[PDB]
């Protein structure tokens, strides 16, 4: 038959379902960033856990190793490129010191809210889901779209959105047309 | 069908090997020809790859070579007189390789003139393969050994 298509899980659940300290930390962090559920935190923890695993593996290797230099520089460059890691912490020792709030800072919902296009973070999420926000000249309706630094300045309302120069929406057109 | 595979046998340690696969055509076998002496009758057999083999069922004459003079003539053969494998073949006059036969001496005599009427020969051909009973003439120590074995 045809070749298999690869797929993988993007999260992992905690081993202890009920732990007040972890439940409160997750709920507080979800309330701060307007997340729908805990799986988006499991996803962030999973991808940071594998970034850390890669960094740990390179850090156990000797310095000046060609492989350590190549994949470590690629991973650091990617993290600076995606804005999670600051420009003054390119040492592969601060990657282990990285935290989930660094990744949650770079979400589209967070950047739109911090750019003022929405009243609150939940208004930011509904603005994204309702196809009003465009990054560059492309409409993005995924709240978890991680905004790069070079894409940061091009976040604005979609040109065909009611809030961005488009025609009036269904409700307004129904009201003003009567 | 007769086959050559070692699957039917048991291992060196004695273990009875189980049934692995059914018999394959690419290892078959066929019956011995048992060449006799009589009017030249050969049957061609369709072998693997499109080749052809010629069973010598019975033959009368084949070419025999005198090694000392480098001369090969087609001459009659009387019968097989000594066979290291089986004496039943000697008794029933079955022509196979390594079998001592007696040949008509007239062509070798006539060549000798131009340059007991039956000469000994050893068939080197494989009649069950090619259909020819071709051999050479005993001379020297080979001759002495076979004559000692024949007379006893």
């Amino acid at each position: 038959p045809r070749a298999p298509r690869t797929y993988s899980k993007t999260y992992s659940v905690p081993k202890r379902p009920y732990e007040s300290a972890r439940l409160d930390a997750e709920l507080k962090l979800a309330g701060e960033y307007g997340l729908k559920n805990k799986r988006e935190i499991y996803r962030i923890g999973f991808q940071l856990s594998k970034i850390r695993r890669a960094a740990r593996d390179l850090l156990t290797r000797d310095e000046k190793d060609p492989k350590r230099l190549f994949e470590g520089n690629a991973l650091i460059r990617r993290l600076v490129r995606i804005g999670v890691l600051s420009e003054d912490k390119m040492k592969l020792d601060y990657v282990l010191a990285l935290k989930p709030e660094d990744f949650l800072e770079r979400r589209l919902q967070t950047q739109v809210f911090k750019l003022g296009l929405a009243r609150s973070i939940h208004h930011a999420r509904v603005l994204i889901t309702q196809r009003h926000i465009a990054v560059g000249k492309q409409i993005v309706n995924i709240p978890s779209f991680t905004v790069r630094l070079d894409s940061q300045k091009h976040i604005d309302f979609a040109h065909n959105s009611p809030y961005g120069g488009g025609r009036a929406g269904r409700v307004k057109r129904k009201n003003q047309g009567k | 069908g007769i086959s050559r595979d070692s699957r039917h046998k048991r291992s060196a340690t004695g273990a009875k090997r189980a049934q692995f696969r059914k018999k394959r055509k690419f290892e078959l076998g066929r019956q011995p020809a048992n060449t006799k002496i009589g009017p030249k009758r050969i049957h061609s057999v369709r072998t693997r790859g499109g080749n052809q083999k010629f069973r010598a069922l019975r033959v009368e004459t084949g070419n025999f070579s005198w090694g000392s003079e480098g001369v090969s003539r087609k001459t009659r053969i009387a019968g097989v007189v000594y066979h290291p494998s089986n004496n039943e073949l000697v008794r029933t006059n079955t022509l196979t390789k390594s079998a001592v036969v007696q040949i008509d001496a007239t062509p070798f005599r006539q060549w000798y003139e131009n340059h007991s009427g039956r000469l000994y020969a050893v068939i080197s051909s494989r009649p069950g393969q090619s259909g020819r009973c071709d051999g050479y003439i005993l001379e020297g120590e080979e001759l002495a050994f076979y004559l000692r074995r024949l007379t006893a």
Partner: protein
Amino acid sequence: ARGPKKHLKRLAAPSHWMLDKLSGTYAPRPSAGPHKLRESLPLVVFLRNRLKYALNGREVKAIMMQQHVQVDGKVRTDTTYPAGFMDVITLEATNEHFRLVYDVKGKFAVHRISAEEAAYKLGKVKKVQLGKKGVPYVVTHDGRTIRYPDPLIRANDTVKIDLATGKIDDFIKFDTGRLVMVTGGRNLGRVGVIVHREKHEGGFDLVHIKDALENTFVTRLSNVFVIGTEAGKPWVSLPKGKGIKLSISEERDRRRAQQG
């Protein structure tokens, strides 16, 4: 099983064809021909996946059925014809000539050549022995048999075939210092000079080859193809990159500078 196989699953195809996983279940099974199955490039792959002149197999079949494609100076209409190493493909309708030479990355480069260079090819002598009527002959790497060779020709040499008469123009003796391309292993596509040949009777002879960057590697003698009389003097045009192997970090730096 009961006879020769006629299909090739896409996942089981040679990796240097660079076929995609999801384009289908099967891959083109190369026909019998001058080159081995694993070391060849079918014309459907060359004309559709590499040059992208044809968009699909119906078009490659229409192209070849209009008599456009010639390999080594003869018209081929077999869509699965096994084109291989050093073969010359000429499409005079588009006025294009290609030579199939490995690049240092292990794949068949798209290396265009002039018609004058497309008028010949090189072949590695595999064996010298006597034919019928006691006539010696040479077998090259693409299965060619050339009669009445130069009595100095021995195994592992390379001859230059006129490719229009099938005769031998001239040859190169196998010796220290000759330019070589590797035709097998993980050093596929690399070009260098012989420094020292280490023999192993009853086994596989090993050849030590030095890169243009003074990198030394060892490979089996069966993977060595002489392409020039000395360093920097190949008998065929080399593909882009000149057979110099760069580390992955150096390649990353070069691509970054080239793209900005």
